[PDB]
């Protein structure tokens, strides 16, 4: 169908943001990451806030916005 189910989403890693991380700005909301934020890490290594890309993945496409690769096998 080209979107993810909840149970598929839960298979993707969640990362808590920390100061030394390379992640800097979320390319969907265009806000800086902050010390507690929850990031969704796609298997291609592209990352977003959970709150920003989860609706994308479950209502728009199950492919990475940047590299267009499917996020589940
Ligand atoms: Zn965001
Ligand atoms: Zn990607």
Swiss-Prot record:
Zn finger (RING-type) start-end: 26-68
Tissue expression profile of the protein: Widely expressed (at protein level). In normal pancreas, expressed in islets, but not in ducts, nor in acini (at protein level).
Effect of residue 29 to Y: Found in a tumor sample; uncertain significance; abolished ability to regulate protein trafficking and localization
Record PTM: Autoubiquitinated.
Localization, UniProt: Endoplasmic reticulum membrane; Late endosome membrane; Lysosome membrane; Nucleus inner membrane
Annotated phenotype, changing residue 44 to A: Complete loss of E3 ligase activity
Quaternary structure note: Interacts with ERN1.
Pathology noted in the entry: Developmental and epileptic encephalopathy 73: A form of epileptic encephalopathy, a heterogeneous group of severe early-onset epilepsies characterized by refractory seizures, neurodevelopmental impairment, and poor prognosis. Development is normal prior to seizure onset, after which cognitive and motor delays become apparent. DEE73 is an autosomal dominant form with onset at birth.
General function of this protein: E3 ubiquitin-protein ligase that regulates cell proliferation. Involved in apoptosis regulation. Mediates ER stress-induced activation of JNK signaling pathway and apoptosis by promoting ERN1 activation and splicing of XBP1 mRNA. Also involved in protein trafficking and localization.
Domain notes per entry: The RING-type zinc finger domain is required for E3 ligase activity and for promoting ER stress-induced JNK activation and apoptosis.
Protein name according to UniProt: E3 ubiquitin-protein ligase RNF13
Organism, as annotated: Homo sapiens
Gene that this sequence comes from: RNF13
């Amino acid at each position: 169908m080209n979107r993810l189910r909840k149970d598929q989403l839960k298979k993707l890693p969640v990362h808590k943001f920390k100061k030394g991380d390379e992640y800097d700005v979320c390319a969907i909301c265009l806000d800086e990451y902050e010390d507690g934020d929850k990031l969704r890490i796609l298997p291609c290594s592209h990352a977003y806030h959970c709150k920003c890309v989860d609706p994308w993945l479950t209502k728009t496409k199950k492919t990475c916005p940047v590299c267009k690769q499917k996020v589940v096998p």
